[PDB]
Amino acid sequence: XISXXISXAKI
Amino acid sequence: XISXXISXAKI
Amino acid sequence: XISXXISXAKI
Amino acid sequence: XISXXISXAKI
Amino acid sequence: XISXXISXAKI
Amino acid sequence: XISXXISXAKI
Amino acid sequence: XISXXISXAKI
Amino acid sequence: XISXXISXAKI
Numbered sequence: 001x002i003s004x005x006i007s008x009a010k011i
Numbered sequence: 012x013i014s015x016x017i018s019x020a021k022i
Numbered sequence: 023x024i025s026x027x028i029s030x031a032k033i
Numbered sequence: 034x035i036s037x038x039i040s041x042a043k044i
Numbered sequence: 045x046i047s048x049x050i051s052x053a054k055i
Numbered sequence: 056x057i058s059x060x061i062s063x064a065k066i
Numbered sequence: 067x068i069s070x071x072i073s074x075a076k077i
Numbered sequence: 078x079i080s081x082x083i084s085x086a087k088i
């Protein structure tokens with residue numbers, strides 16, 4: 001589905 | 012400065 | 023002076 | 034969702 | 045400096 | 056549903 | 067700086 | 078389905 005998500009580490 | 016970046020593996 | 027800043031780890 | 038936030042340690 | 049942060053309105 | 060977002064203008 | 071960003075319309 | 082996509086324009 002949607003994997004990984006968002007933390008701030010990359011964005 | 013900028014370290015890392017986007018590969019598609021997470022994003 | 024300054025210490026830290028914004029890395030993405032918190033923001 | 035929201036995780037962490039500003040304390041002063043980094044910011 | 046680091047001003048405002050989030051309200052929830054956009055995020 | 057999903058509303059708002061971030062452009063960089065504010066955040 | 068940080069521009070473009072995300073609303074869900076594309077991403 | 079999923080439309081729009083990641084193009085590199087924003088990400």
Ligand SMILES: [Cl-]
Nearest residue numbers: 007008010011
């Ligand atoms: Cl991220």
Ligand SMILES: [Cl-]
Nearest residue numbers: 009014015016
């Ligand atoms: Cl990284």
Ligand SMILES: [Cl-]
Nearest residue numbers: 018019021022
């Ligand atoms: Cl990535």
Ligand SMILES: [Cl-]
Nearest residue numbers: 029030032033
């Ligand atoms: Cl940070």
Ligand SMILES: [Cl-]
Nearest residue numbers: 035037038039
């Ligand atoms: Cl908080």
Ligand SMILES: [Cl-]
Nearest residue numbers: 040041043044
């Ligand atoms: Cl902090």
Ligand SMILES: [Cl-]
Nearest residue numbers: 051052054055
């Ligand atoms: Cl907000």
Ligand SMILES: [Cl-]
Nearest residue numbers: 062063065066
């Ligand atoms: Cl914004």
Ligand SMILES: [Cl-]
Nearest residue numbers: 061062063064
């Ligand atoms: Cl905007």
Ligand SMILES: [Cl-]
Nearest residue numbers: 062070071087
């Ligand atoms: Cl745009």
Ligand SMILES: [Cl-]
Nearest residue numbers: 073074076077
């Ligand atoms: Cl988008």
Ligand SMILES: [Cl-]
Nearest residue numbers: 075076080081
């Ligand atoms: Cl369109």
Ligand SMILES: [Cl-]
Nearest residue numbers: 070071086087
């Ligand atoms: Cl664009």
Ligand SMILES: [Cl-]
Nearest residue numbers: 084085087088
């Ligand atoms: Cl994109």
